[PDB]
Symmetry: D2
Subunit: 250 residues, 4 copies
């Protein structure tokens, strides 16, 4: 019987590439999404055309609120409902936008940025663990630039920092259950859809290795390694996939 993985924010971009590779590797997948219903349903279609009954979608808002724990339990429950098991959790979904110190209220920005990047991963990790020849693991999508952050992204960066602490704390606490917890930290990969071509090229030219951003697939490759049998002694590790960008001084 095939293992099963949940990938959050899997309709588009990096999450999608992660879901596709897991699926190509033999996993059944839960394609979590928030707003991208069309693209989620379309991906599950593609995947199920390749192997019947191997992909399902699951909608949820991962903003912090008093119902977030229920929503996160339900995401994990959805994997058990579809597939009878849950072997891998990929915490990929993420809000990302500036919150300068000097439309949304600051309460909402806190809820969204810290919820998606930190609190929801924690709650999903709880629910994953609670529900548990096995290779169980969690991969959190971190950020290679968290000690050299973008200007005016304090809430986002706080979330990704918290995500590092989660990675370490959960690796430690879940090791006795045979659950490994690790990270993959892109530098610049697929640039924001809203970002102009001038800015995108400014970022590309900063990367030592190729003067280009990572493909979604290059990020996915490292996720695939961490969940694989070739990483069974690896826990609490965060693998940069940044083409050297974090090594470059101002």
């Amino acid at each position: 019987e095939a293992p099963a993985a949940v990938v959050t924010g899997a309709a588009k971009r990096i999450g999608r590439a992660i879901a596709v590779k897991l699926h190509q590797t033999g996993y059944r997948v839960v394609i979590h999404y928030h707003n991208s219903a069309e693209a989620a349903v379309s991906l599950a279609d593609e995947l199920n055309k390749e192997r019947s009954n191997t992909a399902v979608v699951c909608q949820a808002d991962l903003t912090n609120s008093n119902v977030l724990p229920a929503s996160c339990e339900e995401i994990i429950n959805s994997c058990f409902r579809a597939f009878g098991r849950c072997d891998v959790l990929v915490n990929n979904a993420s809000a990302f936008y500036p919150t300068p110190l000097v439309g949304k209220t600051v309460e909402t920005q806190v809820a969204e940025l810290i919820g998606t990047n930190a609190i929801a991963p924690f709650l999903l990790t709880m629910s994953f663990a609670q529900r548990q020849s096995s290779n169980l693991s969690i991969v959190n999508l971190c950020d290679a630039m968290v000690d050299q952050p973008c200007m005016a992204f304090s809430l986002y960066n706080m979330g990704k920092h918290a995500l590092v602490g989660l990675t370490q704390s959960a690796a430690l606490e879940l090791a006795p259950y045979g659950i490994r917890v690790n990270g993959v930290a892109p530098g610049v990969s697929l640039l924001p859809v809203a970002m102009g071509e001038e800015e995108k090229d400014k970022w590309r030219r900063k990367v030592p290795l190729g003067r280009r951003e990572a493909s979604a697939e290059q990020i996915a490759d490292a996720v695939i390694f961490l969940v694989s049998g070739s990483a069974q002694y690896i826990t609490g590790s965060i693998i940069k996939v940044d083409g050297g960008l974090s090594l470059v001084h101002a």
Copy 2:
């Protein structure tokens, strides 16, 4: 005239020691507190006996909620109402307790308290502090030296302290144009919990290379004093461990 500092969670233990040292240094102080009114007031009275009209108290819950931003604004405003200025913010207040991943407070409450006190409140206080701005303005965040070797079953606390490092770095960068420096002090084992058996306290003490003893509140306060001083005027985004070498000790 004398500069002014806000210290959160200043009624007792480390926060108290910071407030006393800042006051001894010449600062007027806002003593923020949550539940410890009697201790906050007795500290304010002691300091005002020393120098009249140099200490006030300010009560607020720093749990995450819809009203936290207003509460944090009001804390900063209280320093301005009392003293006409606000030169230093010390983010010290902190909830601390285990939140195991596997099995009275609901988890959403534990999130609100642990992430709100250790991270979100610091961020909102930082905004408000900066929004209100020979000056020497700075922020000191009380971090945790053991953040990469955490206690078992303290994920939310540890997430909170990691977020606080992120804030220290993001705010140091963003506020540097305004002359506001943002730094941290990271205790390892300082004052142990009050009811903790001495025999348990000794297990921790024995781990500390430098003297097999916890740091006093005053030793922690000394590093805060340095960071706010004229001797640290090029220092920003730095987190100073005050841990007796504890974080260098392998399992």
Copy 3:
């Protein structure tokens, strides 16, 4: 045609496992050794029995000295001689023993511990680059460098300098398409000299399974880093430590 890899200190233990896995992946290998000629040759014999003329041995002391640069150049040269290319360098050879601050001369200890763990890797990295596809270097680091063993200052200094080399070389060689990464074991194969009871004390500390990494688990991370699956990865040091570095005192 098949790529080629140089593995230092490859006759035994972790370097042997790295050599074997690279060979199994289709690499031709140079098996470097200092004192372990019999073991290096027996490994070569085994690999060459699988696939003829795909493994050679190369002797060198990697202690720092006036001749270390020339010896390093010759290690790289030996790979070009045997196989006509050098795609992969694994810096694995390492001296490891205590150097207490308060009481071999100390300068010999400096030469061995800093030479093997840092200077030879730097020299080999220069020679490898000077001669220059999926090119990469993997340096064998140490997950416990920030929580070091008591009385191992020079060893620790050397492993710290190797982190610095990994990062400086990743930056500098990126224009040549040469990636430079690290693998950091915690406790893997314990020293042969170490008493059994002492070995169990280390094993007990590891969160994930209360045991040491096999040499093959270390080798697995090396394989990933040299693979096409890691082509955007440079400057990265992957811990393979079963969570040991996360455990407080």
Copy 4:
């Protein structure tokens, strides 16, 4: 009786600023120098005119060789000869120049100088200081940009990374003797005398806090903190004095 300190490479620039500040705080000082005899003597004369018999010079090459241990022992002996004690060691002396990996001194001389001055001499001076033994401490001058290094400075960077390891190893090992071991990490402070103004300004413009390099005095201030009774629980800590430079991405 006044405490005594050894400052390596103290004739000029940051090491002079450190010796001066320690002197102003009440220390007697050994001003170590290599080539800068005239400057070393000029400094010692100034300090001695402020307080008679409180400064001496001490010549030594700190390049690695088989006699470097003897030279480092002698630097510590010189402090005991002059002053009867040695309370503080400041490892400031440093060679600094590029060593490109792909293409003058031989490479082995570059290793001896860059690794010697930045790491091996500090290690040997630490052994000698400890062997000879209140508020005892060592402060190592590190480099805040060691994880975002300058292009073509691998050996220098290797040396500064080794120095971080010594700071940590020695803090652990010398704690039971009450010897604290810490570091101070400038980012951009006094630029090299051969750098032209335009190039200096390129560096200065990178610094978030004031668009300017640290003064020598600012570096010295952090040293003085770490040696003081205000840091008596601090050991194994490295204080960045970089005006935020290490936080600025490419």
